[PDB]
From a paper:
The SAGA complex is a regulatory hub involved in gene regulation, chromatin modification, DNA damage repair and signaling. Human SAGA is a 20-subunit, 1.4-MDa complex with five functional modules: a scaffolding core that includes TBP-associated factors (TAFs); a TRRAP (Transformation/Transcription domain Associated Protein) containing a phosphoinositide-3-kinase (PI3K)-related pseudoprotein kinase (ΨPIKK); a histone acetyltransferase (HAT); a deubiquitinase (DUB) and a metazoan-specific splicing (SPL) module. SAGA regulates gene expression by interacting with enhancer-bound activators, recruiting the transcriptional machinery and modifying promoter-proximal chromatin and is known to be involved also in DNA damage repair and signaling. Here we present the cryogenic-electron microscopy (cryo-EM) structure of human SAGA (hSAGA) and show how the arrangement of distinct structural elements results in a globally divergent organization from that of yeast, with a different interface tethering the core module to the TRRAP subunit, resulting in a dramatically altered geometry of functional elements and with the integration of a metazoan-specific splicing module.
Single-particle negative stain showed the presence of a central core domain sitting atop the distinct cradle-shaped TRRAP module, with a Y-shaped density flexibly tethered to the core domain proximal to the TRRAP cradle. The lack of a stabilizing TAF6L HEAT–TAF5L NTD interaction probably contributes to increased flexibility of the TAF6L HEAT repeat domain, a critical platform for HAT and SPL module integration. Furthermore, the local repositioning of the TAF5L NTD exposes the TAF6L interface to allow for SPL module incorporation in hSAGA. The SPL module subunits, SF3B3 and SF3B5, are shared with the metazoan spliceosomal SF3b core complex within the U2 small nuclear ribonucleoprotein. Therefore, SF3B3/SF3B5 cannot be simultaneously incorporated into hSAGA and the SF3b SPL complex.
Author numbering:
A (entry chain N): 507 to 559
B (entry chain B): 1 to 203, 255 to 585
C (entry chain E): 10 to 133
D (entry chain F): 5 to 134
E (entry chain J): 104 to 233, 248 to 331
F (entry chain C): 1 to 26, 31 to 254
G (entry chain D): 59 to 87, 96 to 117, 119 to 264
H (entry chain H): 114 to 181, 188 to 218
Amino acid sequence: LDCHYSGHHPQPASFCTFGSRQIGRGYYVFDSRWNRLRCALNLMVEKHLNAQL
Amino acid sequence: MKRVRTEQIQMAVSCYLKRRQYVDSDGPLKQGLRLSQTAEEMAANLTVQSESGCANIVSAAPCQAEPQQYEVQFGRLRNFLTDSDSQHSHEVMPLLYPLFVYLHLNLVQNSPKSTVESFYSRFHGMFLQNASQKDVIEQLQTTQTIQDILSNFKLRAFLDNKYVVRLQEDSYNYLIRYLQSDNNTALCKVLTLHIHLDVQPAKSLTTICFYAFYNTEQLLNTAEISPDSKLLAAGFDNSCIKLWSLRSKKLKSEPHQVDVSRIHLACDILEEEDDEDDNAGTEMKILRGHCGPVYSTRFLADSSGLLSCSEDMSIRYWDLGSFTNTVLYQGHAYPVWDLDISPYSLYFASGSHDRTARLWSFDRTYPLRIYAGHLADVDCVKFHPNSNYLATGSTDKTVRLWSAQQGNSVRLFTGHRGPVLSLAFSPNGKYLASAGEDQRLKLWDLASGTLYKELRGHTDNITSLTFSPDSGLIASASMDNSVRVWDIRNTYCSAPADGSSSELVGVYTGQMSNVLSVQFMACNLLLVTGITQE
Amino acid sequence: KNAPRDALVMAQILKDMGITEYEPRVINQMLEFAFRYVTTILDDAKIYSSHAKKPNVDADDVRLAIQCRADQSFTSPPPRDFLLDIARQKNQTPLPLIKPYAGPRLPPDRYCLTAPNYRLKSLI
Amino acid sequence: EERRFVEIPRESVRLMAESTGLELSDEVAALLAEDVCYRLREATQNSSQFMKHTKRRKLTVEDFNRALRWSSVEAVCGYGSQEALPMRPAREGELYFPEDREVNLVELALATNIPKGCAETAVRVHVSYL
Amino acid sequence: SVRQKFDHRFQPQNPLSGAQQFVAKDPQDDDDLKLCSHTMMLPTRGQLEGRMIVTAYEHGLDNVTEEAVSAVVYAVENHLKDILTSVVSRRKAYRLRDGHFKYAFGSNVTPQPYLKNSVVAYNNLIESPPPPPDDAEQQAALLLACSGDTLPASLPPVNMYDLFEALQVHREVIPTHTVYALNIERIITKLWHPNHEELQQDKVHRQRLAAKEG
Amino acid sequence: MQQALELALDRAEYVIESARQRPPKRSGRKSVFQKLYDLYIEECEKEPEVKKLRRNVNLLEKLVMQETLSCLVVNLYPGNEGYSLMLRGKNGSDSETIRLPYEEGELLEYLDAEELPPILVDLLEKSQVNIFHCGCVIAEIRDYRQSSNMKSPGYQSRHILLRPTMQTLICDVHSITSDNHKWTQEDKLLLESQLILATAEPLCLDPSIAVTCTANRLLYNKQKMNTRPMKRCFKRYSRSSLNRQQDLSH
Amino acid sequence: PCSLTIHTIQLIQHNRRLRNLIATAQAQNXXXXXXXXXXXXXXXXXXXXXXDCKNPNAPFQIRHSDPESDFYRGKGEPVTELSWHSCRQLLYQAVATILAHAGFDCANESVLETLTDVAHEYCLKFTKLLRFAVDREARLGQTPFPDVMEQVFHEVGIGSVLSLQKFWQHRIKDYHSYMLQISKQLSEEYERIVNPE
Amino acid sequence: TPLVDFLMQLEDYTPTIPDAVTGYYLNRAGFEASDPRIIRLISLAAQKFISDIANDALQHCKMKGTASSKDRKYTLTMEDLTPALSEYGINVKKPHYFT
Amino acid sequence: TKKKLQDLVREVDPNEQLDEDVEEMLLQIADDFIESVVTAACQLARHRKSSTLEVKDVQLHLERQWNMWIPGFGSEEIRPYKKACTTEAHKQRMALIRKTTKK
Amino acid sequence: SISFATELQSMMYSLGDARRPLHETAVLVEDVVHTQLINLLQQAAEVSQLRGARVITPEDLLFLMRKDKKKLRRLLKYMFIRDYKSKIVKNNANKRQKIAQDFLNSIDQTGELLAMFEDXXXXXXXXXXXXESRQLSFSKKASKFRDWLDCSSMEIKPNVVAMEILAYLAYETVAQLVDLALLVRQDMVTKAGDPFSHAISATSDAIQPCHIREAIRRYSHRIGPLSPFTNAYRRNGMAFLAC
């Protein structure tokens, strides 16, 4: 005669993200405008890491 | 997979500070003092940061490669400044000399030989009459290559420093109106990088007065009194605002053609009714025009007008000449909770259900600054006594102090257990109080940004606060239908009836239902409002 | 006792949020709310399953229906991240230059509620 | 550190789904139950937010419908009477239902019931010393 | 009693925890999108396909049926026209057929409903059984006369405030929350109107032009 | 009222004048901002040569030559070439990026305002270099947009300071908390509070509206040329607008 | 006319019950004393008189509103304020009256209490549309239509205010006339069957 | 027979909805409820709105029992209101029994 | 063919014309619209393990969310109306409640 | 597979179209009419289920068209003409009219429906020598239509009488769509400054598909009363252009 209860706050099965996407670590965007620039910069840093060896 | 410890937070903070190069290459336990400053040194800091960069480079400069234009722009500007017959055309005349010198000097560093000579010929004959400026105007004549500018001595200070000019606001707007009229990009680059315009503005214990509303019936929401203590305004769940005259005079409106709380058909005539002296005043007025429950009404510094916010996500200014809404500020897409006005009626801000607050001016109908960063509804807002910082309470149990002009969070206090509901600054500009559902009253020390004092004793939600004009006492109202004044100043006592002992001065829980407001006035006055039943 | 279990659940929720007292029929309102939400979710799941040409519904259909429902109805303001971007793009503009005033200055008339309809005739 | 959160039973969700005409499995019922509980708590928080800014303790049906309207959700109609609606148990003792009495319209249609207006608001000043 | 007062409050689910993860591909010149914000035009059928395929990839698909491109183009145009109609309705009269179909968006016919002449003309000129030029000219004159607008006035071009009001009022033209919520905030930050000083300079420039004309 | 405002404005004018003329004087490593403040202090003592001119006008561009500083370079090629980024290496080496077109002006907006983009930092940290200086990152802007001299330099090296913004701080909060540990909401707020307290500008807590008058004057003069019509006019003739116009001839 | 139409519907139902009982009983064969002539539902105290000597269907007659009249000028006194508790009761009664006029005579409590709230919502939305249109006009100083009421009528499906006259004609006046004709016809039938000549 | 102008007609249309209700609703949106014309027009619009639903409900009730007479008591059930209301995007789903 | 906003505007009303900011905003809104619609259609395709993004996915999504029906793509997918019948237990409890009400 | 592309290309010109109607226009109109007919049939099926017949009788279809009076009146007049024509070819030939009047008499409550009912051509246009190409053409029409609809794989089906109504509804759909397209074209090419030109409108050079697409988009929107300031009340469905 007890109302069934759980030990954690409930969570929604599916919810509404605002169309966001996570670029790297700790950064989110909503418009896909930095895609080109992010690809370019990633390659630049890749190469700049290659040369120091 | 365990909750981090208190020290680990400091560890991560230090790691961040070291990585971003904020502190020396060791334990900066010496550092951590520069948490305040005076007026002159603030001015020095802001002046150093003002000249530590260029506000606009990428877009302010032209991109087309067409050297012919430098002639056309300057020629159009000269023609316009000549035929003008205004008093501004005077004040905006001195700029021509630095403009010519800098345009020529920039031509030199990139321009084939054809252009520079035509340029010098076309305009040079207007900087001769004065003596101090004939020298360099002539010196430039013999100058082709970059070595000219570096070698020469007078050209250098021009190249590596900015020219000063002084203008009024009207004159500067005179220049801006022209600049925006058509492509004048080259001149904009010169003004951005080299010239430095400077614009400045043109030329014996206390006594309580209590108020009670009888016939409200779960509709009264808030009330307030004007600084000069002559008016009393209240808002209601059914959208409407009522105003009362505290004095013995009556309230009468004056002629006005337009009213928004009225509807006319196509077959009507706008006529100023003459059957009006029959009224010759009354003691009360109903302000109409919001279409939702009202949540705040505030007076101006000089009691000239009224401002209010409502559930319908609108803010309205009421003119007490006619008791009619005459301005409407629309800057929100969600219901607005709170409102507040700056000490001398220069600004006013508003918290909203949309997790943000916004800054306004009384002469523009659109927001000016946005303070994002809270995680939930911004329920409370208060200006600083100097009107340069902004505090805001939120349901996320956090309080943030903001920089008004710039608009970034400068402090972030934590410690509340539940949502916050009120704020108050002491008129000496030293402390900040806050209260909420937790039933604890915290005073914060702004300079150090740390807890300064904690008071207990209320048994239900605290919903108002206020200081005395000498930071002597702090009064609070709670949902327990009680008013308690407090004293924090060194004067100590031994009266521990509850947690707080030596601060609790007086308690007032007479025959009274829910409380509304608390204020202070010139001499030991404490106005209160609320509803009662007996 | 008198009440069924669901009424007790709803009362417990109201207590949890911190509601001391309330009108009685609020609980009936909440019961109808839950019933309608569940029924509509199931009805949408039926359509999404029949779109996939399969037998009786399962978890995936329900989750898809819930996602579609939440993309429309149960809303709330955007998060802090987006607001920070728009705030950055807004704060760059200049503020008015203060000057002595004989009281606060109101905005220009063309942008104030002080214009009578031009169709209407005026009388002396 | 230990905490509780009442949730509806699987049986209630299955009973609702029955009216639709679908037999639900085991995992789906719990999924739906948790989702519905989350939505109920969200809506209740939103409703309480409006009441917070009025200085009154009772929560009305108008507050609930207002909060629903702002959250872009259709409103619930038929519960704004300010009078209790007692529940009724059936014979066995496990099913309940609300009383819904048939009403003869013409009687209410042909009847004069003058209402009493409201009284105007007024404020009395009340000074004191301490 | 107080300590266990705020332990069962509501904890909203963060909307970013379910954020989509972004993976970097090869930076090529051919792999470009042409978002309409960059090219101030509506995307053609070919341009739309490039980004449709790119988006499809991150969901583990192969390619697009090429009938989808047509449907998406048509839908985009339809949606833009719906928003434009919502904005237009707020500042011009229009007619109705079958109760909802709005066609004639000028401000002409609009018989004023409080004139005895208008009442009579409404019954006849509206219900037409479902046109020599002289008769049509006469009846057009009659319709313009009944409209009541002796001295009609016009509006400046459509600006931000009109869009803001239109979006706030109707709100059924953007059923999806994501599109509406993000763009309404953007629209707010572009509200603007000239302040006192700019109007003063407009005054001065008008004096100048009048003088140089005389 | 009007009298109080006039008093406050007089106070602000006096403070501005004195701070311009008579600056007050306030370690192994001396901060880049400390060096800027010191180079400002020096320039006050001197006298100028020409009447109607000042010396302390470019504290950064002058404090560049006075020593080596690691910067981030931007190349703005002419015509429809685009732009590109360079990163000087430790070994007298270099690296450069693809040429991005002049339509995708997302980064240029950040450069136009002296605000540090948040995409930049996440990578610049991965590239183990010490180009940060008290949060801010100095950048050099080379532009061959306008030149027909066919020389070696052929560009105007401008320097600017990309100050960090509230976006960067929230990104940092997100980044630090992504460690293996657990974090509760209270703990995230504590971390954010500490970070804000550490790196915040000092507060001028004083009850007198002279402070706000001074602040308004200085900020207004800092940014008095960002009115909406100004930006519309700039945008009306920018390169992407021209590229659109050519298409209209057909 | 609404009240009298409800009355006439009741009378007609009563008459049909009597007619069917009598006809069936005497088709099969006080069972010898038929009921009795019921009773007309006394016509109203206004419609009656209108049913004076001027017979308003005369020619060369003009009727127009005096522009000095209070109603035409739109002048009066603020209506009586009343709380929500009583407003809901009054709207409840109005909804019951409309349902009765429609043709129903009983219903479930839930249906009526739900229609009340639907009407509540409709009224709120109508008035909010009015609010926004009024504010916009007050700012720009002009309206798309001749006045705001026409705009709001257009925005909620109704065509124009001039459609209300057709609505009233068809739905009220003609409905009342139809009911009266039916009542007279059925009464005459009952009269012919009770007392054959 | 006559064709008087609209304002002359409007003075004869009596609304079922009382005036005080329309005043209550006008006061919420911030209008002074003193003009009789506006009260009349708003009340008439509301009356039309309710009347259409009533008509549709009665027709649906008539059609319900056809296959498988005139003298019968017409009562209103939710199964008659639901389709009539759905014409206006109102989705009525009400529980029957709780637990 | 080239397409501009004014081309759409002409369809609705020839005589109207917008400001520049409105033109920027409408294109931004169109970008967001496409970014949402295509993603939703892709998920609907992902549901049925299909390998290709067929048009019927877009048709279903547009009909259900945006209430949009593009007319020129056939009628291969129209659900045939069902009876929507109830179950034994439901009718059982309804009859039980009817009985309990009768007496 | 079947199609009416050539037939519709001639039907359209009857309704104020160019001498040579475009082709793809008719192609799209065909699909529009097909879709509306299918959805209308589903709604009729839902209607009949209340009565419990499992057959789509003419009363069901006549029930959906119970709101617009003018279209209903036209439908009734056409039913009169069809019963009269069949009589002339051969209940005593008042079958369709009997059914219609019976149903309307069944439902009405205000006498508003009956008004449409009560209120020399069929002889003036019949003095020639008609003695059976007409019947054969009608047979071709109906036979082709039944096949093109593909109305077999359905749990319920329409009977002999209702098919006449359905064909008439398709024709009315075509006429209405042509009318709306013409109004849209009238609106587009106005560019009229003179008020008389814009006012006389109350009364290439061919109907391109864009016009029909705009007309359908514009018709699809219904103005509900509970719409403003929200989106929770959408009439999720499709307007019937003919009903």
